[PDB]
Design a protein around this ligand. Structure first.
Ligand SMILES: O=c1ccn([C@@H]2O[C@H](COP(=O)(O)OP(=O)(O)OP(=O)(O)O)[C@@H](O)[C@H]2O)c(=O)[nH]1
Length: 321
């Protein structure tokens, strides 16, 4: 069963959606900065490639002036420290402000702040697998608009309800997009395909991990065109799965497969399998306490999406400790 008036809230959810997406003027400043930093890095390393990654490149990012950049370069004696310090002075002689050398769990990072656009940028060497990660989600976001629409709704819900911190036992935004992709894959008729179970047209390799899938996604623009579910059906339907339908004891959600894999075949309380790094359970951060808070927020989200006379504002009302 579902609401008889569910489509009355399609209007608001998309209005919420297109407000959460970054403005074009903001993204114009990003491409202009990136085109400048690509040409600048290429002057020192003609064989290096700059790739964006993270929220600023998978097309599932909220508005902000911080971008992440992976400097891809090939070789064997690749020392990222000596490169990033040489790169640090090329930024400083380019009149870029606040060129800082930083570390995150010992990975060398350098950060800059562009005076032209006010955008910040964090640069690291050879984080290539994270680049292919965002390429997949960007490729998936091109197939159906409802993926972007649903994922922006859920990500806003996780932040408003204070369940978007892995350091507090909840799930990252990368995990939430995987749950949305997998939810839209299991709807019948399908909204999203399983790119990795298709004829390969893209195949790379990052340290004995071969990422291979079909990435001619503009050939798929009409894939989910036989599924008439609106976003108020999906948003309601998403939280309904994770509150009542997900078999938390035996099930794995698998974008890599587009189906439900068995969990018993091997701390995992909610299993979200990474599409390429398949041993990386994105729910390993959850513990026996935070799983209860997650499922309580799932059950809260479902009843609101099923009963509340104004669910679009009730679903996202902030959580106050
Ligand atoms: O376990 C992970 C998590 C994340 N990532 C990589 O980091 C990216 C997302 O990482 P985040 O979960 O930190 O997204 P975000 O906080 O920056 O987004 P906002 O809610 O702030 O808007 C993803 O694009 C992924 O490639 C991994 O590689 N492994």
């Amino acid at each position: 069963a579902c609401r008889n008036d569910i489509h009355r809230y399609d209007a608001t959810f998309i209005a919420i959606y297109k407000s959460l997406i970054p403005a074009e003027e903001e993204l114009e400043k990003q491409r202009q900065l990136m085109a400048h930093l690509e040409n600048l890095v290429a002057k020192e390393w003609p064989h290096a490639k700059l790739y964006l990654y993270g929220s600023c490149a998978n097309s599932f990012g909220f508005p902000k002036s911080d971008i992440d950049v992976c400097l891809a370069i090939e070789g064997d004696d690749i020392n990222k420290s000596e490169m990033l310090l040489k790169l640090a002075e090329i930024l400083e002689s380019d009149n870029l402000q606040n060129v800082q050398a930083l570390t995150r769990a010992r990975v060398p990072i350098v950060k800059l702040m562009d005076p032209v656009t006010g955008i910040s940028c964090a640069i690291c060497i050879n984080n290539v697998l994270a680049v292919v990660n965002t390429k997949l989600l960007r490729d998936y976001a091109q197939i159906d608009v409802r993926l972007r629409q649903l994922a922006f709704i859920v990500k806003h819900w996780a932040k408003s309800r204070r369940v978007n911190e892995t350091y507090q036992g909840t799930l990252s935004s990368y995990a939430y997009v995987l749950m949305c992709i997998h939810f839209l894959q299991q709807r019948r008729p399908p909204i999203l395909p399983c790119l990795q179970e298709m004829e390969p047209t893209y195949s790379v390799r990052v340290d004995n991990i071969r990422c291979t899938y079909f990435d001619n996604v503009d050939r798929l623009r009409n894939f989910g065109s036989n599924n008439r579910e609106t976003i108020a059906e999906l948003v309601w339907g998403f939280f309904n799965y994770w509150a009542y339908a997900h078999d938390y004891a035996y099930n794995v959600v698998s974008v890599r497969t587009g189906s439900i894999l068995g969990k018993r075949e091997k701390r995992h309380l909610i299993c979200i399998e990474d599409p390429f790094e398949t041993s990386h359970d994105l729910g390993r951060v959850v513990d026996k306490f935070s799983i209860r808070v997650l499922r309580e927020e799932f059950e809260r989200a479902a009843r609101i999406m099923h009963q509340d006379p104004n669910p679009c504002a009730k679903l996202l009302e902030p959580y106050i400790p």
